[PDB]
Amino acid sequence: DPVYAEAYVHVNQYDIVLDVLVVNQTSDTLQNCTLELATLGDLKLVEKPSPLTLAPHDFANIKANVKVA
Amino acid sequence: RTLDLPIYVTRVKGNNVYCLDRECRPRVLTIDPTEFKFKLALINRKYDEVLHMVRNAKLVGQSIIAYLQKKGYPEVALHFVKDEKTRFSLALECGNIEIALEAAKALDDKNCWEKLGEVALLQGNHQIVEMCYQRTKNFDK
Amino acid sequence: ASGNASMVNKLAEGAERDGKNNVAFMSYFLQGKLDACLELLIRTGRLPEAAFLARTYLPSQVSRVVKLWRENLSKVNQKAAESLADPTEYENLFPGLKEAF
Structure with missing residues (x-):
C-alpha cells in the first residue's frame, strides 16, 4: 500500500529491537489499528510508539524495544 | 517497490x-527498479537516478549493506544519512571524514576521536590533526 | 643526569629489551642516531611517524619509507589512500630544496 511498512529486526546489544518502517505513504495519518503487549521469553516486549495515524505520504520509525532478560 | x-x-x-x-x-x-540502473549507474558513478527518485533507505534492519556498507562513493551518503550518531557511523563506514569533521566536533565520545585524529592523519593533514590531539591530551605526542 | 653514551650502548641493548616502543626511541635520539630510531619504527609499525623523522632530520628514508607506508595504504586501496610522489609532483623532495640535508 502507499503505506508500506517494511521492517526488520536489529538486535543490537541484548536488545532485540524492532526497526519498523511504517511508511505511510498513505494519503493521510490513516487510522491505525491495534497492537498488544506480552510477556515474552527471557525478554518481554515492551514498547510501542503510541499514535495511530498513518500520516500522509510520510515515513515513520517505529521502534520496539523488547526487554531482553 | x-x-x-x-x-x-x-x-x-x-x-x-x-x-x-x-x-x-x-x-x-x-514497477520501480532499483538496482539495475544502479550498478550500471554506479559503475558509471551515476546517481542521477536515485536521487531523482529520491529513493533513500539504508536501513530497514539495514539496507546499506549491499555495498553501501561496503560503500561505493560517499555520494551515497548524500542520498540519505541522519543523526550525528548515525552520521558518525558513516563517518567510519565511509570513512566519511568530512562528516567526520563535524561529526567530531559533535562527537565527543573521545575514544572515538581518540582513534580518529591519527586516522585523520593517516588519511592526511596533521595541521588539523594537531588540534584534534590538542584537546585529546596527547600533549606529549 | 651526568649523561653517558656507554650507558646508552648497553642500555640500547636494553632498550631493545623493554617492550614498549617509546623509551627506546629517546635513547636512539639521545645517542643521536636517526638510524636507530628509524629501525626501531620498522618493527613497531610506527609508520606515519617514522616518516616525519625521516623527513625532518633527513636520512631521506622519507623516500624509502614513504613507499612502504603508502603501500600499506595501497593495500587499503583508494587512490587518495594510495597517495603518491617523491622528487616531483605531489611532493617535490629534492626539487623543493629546503631543511634537512
Whole structure:
C-alpha cells in the first residue's frame, strides 16, 4: 500500500529491537489499528510508539524495544 | 517497490509487473527498479537516478549493506544519512571524514576521536590533526 | 643526569629489551642516531611517524619509507589512500630544496 511498512529486526546489544518502517505513504495519518503487549521469553516486549495515524505520504520509525532478560 | 503481506515473486511478465504469494495475496504493479540502473549507474558513478527518485533507505534492519556498507562513493551518503550518531557511523563506514569533521566536533565520545585524529592523519593533514590531539591530551605526542 | 653514551650502548641493548616502543626511541635520539630510531619504527609499525623523522632530520628514508607506508595504504586501496610522489609532483623532495640535508 502507499503505506508500506517494511521492517526488520536489529538486535543490537541484548536488545532485540524492532526497526519498523511504517511508511505511510498513505494519503493521510490513516487510522491505525491495534497492537498488544506480552510477556515474552527471557525478554518481554515492551514498547510501542503510541499514535495511530498513518500520516500522509510520510515515513515513520517505529521502534520496539523488547526487554531482553 | 515493496510487497504487500506475503508475496513471492513468481516471475516477470513485462514492465506491468506481476507478483504472487502462491495463488493469492497478489499484484499488477507499477514497477520501480532499483538496482539495475544502479550498478550500471554506479559503475558509471551515476546517481542521477536515485536521487531523482529520491529513493533513500539504508536501513530497514539495514539496507546499506549491499555495498553501501561496503560503500561505493560517499555520494551515497548524500542520498540519505541522519543523526550525528548515525552520521558518525558513516563517518567510519565511509570513512566519511568530512562528516567526520563535524561529526567530531559533535562527537565527543573521545575514544572515538581518540582513534580518529591519527586516522585523520593517516588519511592526511596533521595541521588539523594537531588540534584534534590538542584537546585529546596527547600533549606529549 | 651526568649523561653517558656507554650507558646508552648497553642500555640500547636494553632498550631493545623493554617492550614498549617509546623509551627506546629517546635513547636512539639521545645517542643521536636517526638510524636507530628509524629501525626501531620498522618493527613497531610506527609508520606515519617514522616518516616525519625521516623527513625532518633527513636520512631521506622519507623516500624509502614513504613507499612502504603508502603501500600499506595501497593495500587499503583508494587512490587518495594510495597517495603518491617523491622528487616531483605531489611532493617535490629534492626539487623543493629546503631543511634537512
